[PDB]
Amino acid sequence: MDDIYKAAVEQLTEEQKNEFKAAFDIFVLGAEDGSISTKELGKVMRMLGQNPTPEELQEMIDEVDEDGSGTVDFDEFLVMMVRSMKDDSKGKFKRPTLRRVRISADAMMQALLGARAKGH
Numbered sequence: 086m087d088d089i090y091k092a093a094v095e096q097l098t099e100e101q102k103n104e105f106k107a108a109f110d111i112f113v114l115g116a117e118d119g120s121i122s123t124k125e126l127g128k129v130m131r132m133l134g135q136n137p138t139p140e141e142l143q144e145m146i147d148e149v150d151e152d153g154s155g156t157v158d159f160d161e162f163l164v165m166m167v168r169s170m171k172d173d174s175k176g177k178f179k180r181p182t183l184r185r186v187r188i189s190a191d192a193m194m195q196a197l198l199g200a201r202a203k204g205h
């Protein structure tokens with residue numbers, strides 16, 4: 086999860102997390118639990134041009150998955166969101182501990198965002 090980023094979502098504004106909440110929701114469109122499962126995640130990844138396997142997807146979910154559910158719920162998605170836009174690979178020294186397919190934040194956003202980003 087990285088409580089540093091877990092604080093960084095708390096650091097975010099209403100606006101900040103608002104579009105993310107939505108992208109969460111649009112990530113999990115039709116999801117019974119409303120949490121991003123590896124298929125919901127896979128959905129968006131394909132929405133963005135990736136064709137994952139749930140193995141990949143689970144590790145993506147795992148990065149934040151605190152409840153150990155195997156699903157990412159909002160704050161979970163949101164920590165990795167902020168973790169993404171803050172630093173996917175800006176200028177740190179991070180080792181990959183799993184399939185590292187990470188669509189840029191706004192980039193992934195744009196996948197789901199056209200469900201909220203207009204309509205008025």
Ligand SMILES: Cc1cccc(Nc2ccccc2)c1
Pocket residue numbers: 121126129130145146147148149157161162165166169186187188189190193
């Ligand atoms: C496909 C994709 C690209 C960029 C960010 C995310 N978010 C995410 C969602 C759930 C767990 C970890 C991260 C998903």
